[PDB]
Amino acid sequence: MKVLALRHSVAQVYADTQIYTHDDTKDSYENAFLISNLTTHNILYFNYSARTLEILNKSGIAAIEIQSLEELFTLIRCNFTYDYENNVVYLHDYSYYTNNEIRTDQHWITKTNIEEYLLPGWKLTYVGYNGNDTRGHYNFSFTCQNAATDDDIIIEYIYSEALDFQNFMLRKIKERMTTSLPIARLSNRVFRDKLFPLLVKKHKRVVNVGPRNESMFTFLNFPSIRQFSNGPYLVKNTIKLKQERWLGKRVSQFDIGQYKNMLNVITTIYHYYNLYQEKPIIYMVGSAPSYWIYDVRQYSDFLFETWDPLDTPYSSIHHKELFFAKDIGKLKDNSILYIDIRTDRGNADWKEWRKVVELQTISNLNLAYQYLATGKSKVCCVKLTAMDLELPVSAKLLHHPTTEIRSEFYLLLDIWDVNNIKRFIPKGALYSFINNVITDNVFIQSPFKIRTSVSDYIVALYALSNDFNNREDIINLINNQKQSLITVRINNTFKDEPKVGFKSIYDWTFLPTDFETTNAIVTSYDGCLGIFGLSISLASKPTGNNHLFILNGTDKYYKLDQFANHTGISRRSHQVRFSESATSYSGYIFRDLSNSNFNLIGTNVENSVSGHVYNALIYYRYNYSFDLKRWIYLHSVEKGKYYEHAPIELIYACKSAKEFASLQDDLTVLRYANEIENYINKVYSITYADDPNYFIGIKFNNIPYIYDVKVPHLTFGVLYISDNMIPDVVKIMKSMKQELFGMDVTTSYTYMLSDGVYVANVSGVLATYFKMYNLFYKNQITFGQSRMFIPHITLSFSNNKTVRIETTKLRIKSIYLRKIRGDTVFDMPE
Amino acid sequence: MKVLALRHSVAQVYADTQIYTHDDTKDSYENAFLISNLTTHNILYFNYSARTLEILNKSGIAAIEIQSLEELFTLIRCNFTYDYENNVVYLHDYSYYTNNEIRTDQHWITKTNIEEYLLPGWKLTYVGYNGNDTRGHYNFSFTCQNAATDDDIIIEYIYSEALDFQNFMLRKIKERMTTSLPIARLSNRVFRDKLFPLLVKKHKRVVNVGPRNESMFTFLNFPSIRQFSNGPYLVKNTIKLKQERWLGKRVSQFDIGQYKNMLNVITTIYHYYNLYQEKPIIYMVGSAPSYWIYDVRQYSDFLFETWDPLDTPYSSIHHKELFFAKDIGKLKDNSILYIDIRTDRGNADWKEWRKVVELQTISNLNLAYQYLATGKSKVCCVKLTAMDLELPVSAKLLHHPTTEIRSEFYLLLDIWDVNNIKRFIPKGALYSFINNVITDNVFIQSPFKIRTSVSDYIVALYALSNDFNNREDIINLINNQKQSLITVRINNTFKDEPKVGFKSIYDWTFLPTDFETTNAIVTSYDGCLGIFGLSISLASKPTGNNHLFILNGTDKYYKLDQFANHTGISRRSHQVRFSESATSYSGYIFRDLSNSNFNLIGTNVENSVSGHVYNALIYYRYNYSFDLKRWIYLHSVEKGKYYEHAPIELIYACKSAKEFASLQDDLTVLRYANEIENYINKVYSITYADDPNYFIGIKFNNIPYIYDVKVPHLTFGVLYISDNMIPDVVKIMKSMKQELFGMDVTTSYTYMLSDGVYVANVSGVLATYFKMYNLFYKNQITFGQSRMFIPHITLSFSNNKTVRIETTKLRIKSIYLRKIRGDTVFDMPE
Ligand SMILES: Nc1nc2c(ncn2[C@@H]2O[C@H](COP(=O)(O)O)[C@@H](O)[C@H]2O)c(=O)[nH]1
Ligand SMILES: Nc1nc2c(ncn2[C@@H]2O[C@H](COP(=O)(O)O)[C@@H](O)[C@H]2O)c(=O)[nH]1
């Protein structure tokens, strides 16, 4: 929501688009609330309270100080992710195209002949992970960098098997200008990099479910984490494959053999991590260029040993420029070995070269076998070619994207693999694997069993909510797990559809009430981002791939007003109320008509009994960052910290939301409202004195209207009690005697309350009524009725016309407790 | 599917539309199968096997003997439900409109002035329940009657609040001619009337969930049954109602006060039934016309006592023509009392008449109170008017449809109600109830808790599968209940949508694999109808409101071929195969290409390994009457009764169905296939010898083709065993030595099996192969491979052209068992 606070003295004015202006010196939390309810994208903050900036940032709303209006202000007309703890700004902005450049996260790409295939004059410039090397471009009051890169395009080109790069880059850039900004993808890079270190330091055992190739670099420094992904391609599974012949498909114009090498070595690193939770020694044979080491070293320090006749720049120690044949004993006991040996494309016939390469393949495989036969705790990966050969059945198969699909694959072998059953594999099956399979993911770990773990911190970022996963197992995991961070699809669909999908790929959808979590925060990406110290320029759109984030066993659950608060609950409510609606009063109007309070709708903008629940039910697709359930619960057990609202006040908003949904045919909001009302009636064991025996009544000295009944009284309470509780009731009355006479009782008009009932309004007594309802309910005394409480002084049982007077205070003369249908009053304090 | 068997001598021929002809004298069950696979609506059966007619009728397919071709045959060009145990034919046919008549199930309607409001010259003729009095119209070789009535139209008119009957009847009749026949509604009347007596006699405790008003007459004679419906309208729930004034809405042109009276008394009967499981004495005050008694007496004998100054025809004993005031002591102790007292519409002012009626209302209420104060086990229902009055809070409110909505309602009171808290109710609330509520259902029983009951026979005909019901509770009920008959929606939707709905009213949808029932029949309405002795002319259309019927703990589960059999599995398969497909061989072709058997597709119509599973997966929307799961299970434990098919044969069809669904983007069939393959691998613990140590080989004397290898042999088996099991294997071989030499081995052509493999086909050995696979699997010996078994004699490792010869028998010379990679053969029987 991009709130920018600039100095009041330097309150510069320009007509920027979608801007707003706010400033006030009354409270520090309500300035944040009122800012959170502004309707535009950018907000300009002029009294610039540091406290209020911190509150916004905790809520996920980006709030930063602006000191160099000349450049700081103008260079923030784009979205960004703000690390407010370290005061860092990560710009997600593709204006750098005006420099005729493509930006990448990876250094190795700069060494390929990629620039030739770009548009004429274009270059690609390395920017570092999340634009770390761009900090020179921006020298502001804060550290500033541009996290936007074109790496998605390059990776898509590599996996797309289409050849011509010029048109591909051009098409993808034009598309990027035609579609809205990929905020989720770009800010999640920052969130991953900040999140997982905090978890590894802060928690004993961290389990990450379904990592994707995007974060392959994130976990390079954290072997403590146990990863669960899709299964690996085993050799035994090649029995199903139909035999095929050589097929020379070219996928990339520029040589990407280094990307293949890097994905291979990283896959091996993570296999080793999965087996032994420690960082291994890396041994590499071949891999002469080896530039990508740099990109790995940016995330974790590793010890690299290289054997290649050419030079390898970034290696730790290039043990020998000479080739490696029988030097097995140099290899230490806790390590991984990458064997990429290609002798040479000789200038001989292709058949002769094939025999040469086949013999070389057998040599490499035997080298791997000797590597793993001698020593415990090691893993290896070999380059083989497609031929008839006998591989172990449990070995893992790798074919990552390479420049051309030309009869090569890789075999990943642990020590359990070497002495295992070996099977004969024809060249046709291996060719079928090379041609029909491209390895999608470097995480080859066994799938995650969706069971609650008591010693683990489970992290399911975008993996659990899928069409094929068991829904009830997901619900039980979220419900009963301690210490977790799990994400599901939101079900922002009308008609309450239980799945949502794109081109026959579907996801399960959940409402916040579909869970029964005891102690957890159920918020948006904004809320979860704030809980971990980040804020963002751009909120979730109501219709999109929006996810609920659920944090189980968090430090922050009891900080109700601090994290996943009601910031922005009324942003959409206010936009609709002031632009499109029939009247700005429509809300109070509808809420009173929904609770059968139509008897008078006269100036109901004052002292309405409905609550936050109405906007959390109706506009949930916008403000689901609120966590309505925790808000209700924490106010059940004070341990009402700011509000002290009676439960009937919550139930009334529930009923109003149900009627609204039925009018709009919003089936989802109808369910959500019914379920929240159920949760309320579970947390509060509410009772209704629909058949009362006694009542509390207030009597006034003067009555500014013509009255036709003998006794004008305000029925201020109605209750159902046994006689023995009359002292208890009395005590509770005494408990607020001061407060009872303190209230500023006012009346301004008379109206018809029902057929044959003519009453005078009473104002200013309702807050006291709710405090007293809370006290009676806490004391297990049945107080209140099924209907809504309407404070009124009955004037006559006749049908008379409405009369108005100026606000005339009313004065209390006695506050009595009387038995219904008994002329006997059982208490009369003055 | 309307199979009509007529005498072969009188094999009359006419060109009726959608007819077919079948006759054969080879088998009695396969004539039924082949008939069940014919594509048209009507089938003409000429060899007319009584056995085959019985088999069809057990399957749900109507199969009746035709003896009077002149009229029996021609008057069966319409659909019907056939009670084949009693040999009765219930026609559902609206041709009777050509007699200018409307047909009703209820006698009371004939006494109203309804005929005046019909179209000129039209009459309404009573036909009895399911047309019992129409048997005179048809005098055939069987008892015959027309169950079709226009009662749906009349009831809809009564509940529709639209006034003009002439246009309403005309519109509804025209609609009935424009839409297809409501078979489900009409045949379910017959099914209910036959089903529930059988259950009450056959089972101790019967529980019926969610009865609707349609079957209000069905349970009149069965107070043993405990009913669960939607809750009742309690007096205490009127606190929510907004006050209203008199509103004179007219709903019907002809007087329907008798329908109101009948619904009132029947509601009271069922309340009494719910409390005390016995038939009560019926006392009625007022209710002078009382014709509807007749309609009640048609279902159960009752004892009626009437007090009215006018005469009451069908009453048991009209105790007194004189009015009933202080005759309370005549009323017996186990009874119900209906108090419909209206003094008279005097010719005085409406206000004076209002006071008269109000005093009369108080008199009636006090009469009811005195009735219930003296005596245990009684229930009462009173006619009251809208006024201020104090009713008990727990009393039940009835407002059934009446002629005009004019300030009257009814109160249902049990003995618990009389001495209960009483509340003051204004006339406005009662008027609001009269104006805004019409009682939808005479079953006012508490809702059903979806829990398994061990002593109960639960019957959920159309109640459980609804949007708001808990899905997992439904699954657990179906899964774990004994002795039940429950119905759910089928999920015939593509894309696998979990709910289906009409105008924001949705239902849960289930596949047959969504349950894990141990001992139950999961079939169609046709199958369930057959299990209870009925058959039907018209099968379920693939896209419709089609329901799965699940019978838990049934006598019929083990009669695999008798009930819920494979009748009609291939009806749709055959229609598609011969009309639209690219070739009639497409099925065998696709099934072989799906299991990677493309190496040869030459004449695969013979000896294909796929099964029934393919058509139960692909065409489930048509043949879901099959209960594929029970078919698989019962053949798992012989206890293969006709087929003796190996499990791999089932799995192959599963894989073929998965590939087919992916090609058609039929997401539902894809899931169903995956789940059935899972069920197969659960029931059979299958093992694969993908890495074999030994093999079974057959050697032949002559080889009709040119062979380039030293030893021509048929690898007839492949297995993985420890050495110690060689005797066991040998014994099993000996177990079928005779059978092994008995088979008619034939070869007809040579083909290429893979790159560098040239083989000769082998035919006629596959059935023996499957018998032997079953024997090895039963003996816990790992036999077979992950791939499909292809019997072949390898001829050379060279790429040669295909050659064909006439069918040349091959002769076995020895059947040996040899260790793989060992020249050592370990057995050689001749
Ligand atoms: N009864 C009640 N009303 C609230 C509460 N919070 C905000 N409101 C009402 O909601 C209004 C803003 O939201 P809107 O009605 O515009 O959606 C405020 O002017 C205020 O009257 C609450 O906690 N209880
Ligand atoms: N393998 C196998 N094929 C069957 C079985 N039952 C029917 N079929 C095949 O299915 C054909 C009829 O079904 P269709 O292929 O036309 O859908 C028959 O001609 C027969 O070849 C069975 O149990 N196993």
Side-chain angles (χ1 to χ4, degrees), chain A residues 413-426:
Chain A
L413 284 177
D414 44 52
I415 88 164
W416 297 257
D417 285 315
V418 165
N419 293 311
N420 211 350
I421 309 187
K422 305 188 173 69
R423 201 190 286 176
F424 175 83
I425 307 146

Side-chain angles (χ1 to χ4, degrees), chain B residues 557-584:
Chain B
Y557 177 93
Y558 286 97
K559 307 177 161 181
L560 177 48
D561 296 306
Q562 309 246 291
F563 296 92
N565 52 16
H566 61 178
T567 54
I569 183 157
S570 298
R571 193 165 100 142
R572 179 57 191 188
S573 299
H574 281 189
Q575 175 165 357
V576 152
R577 181 172 129 127
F578 281 33
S579 67
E580 310 140 26
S581 59
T583 170
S584 61

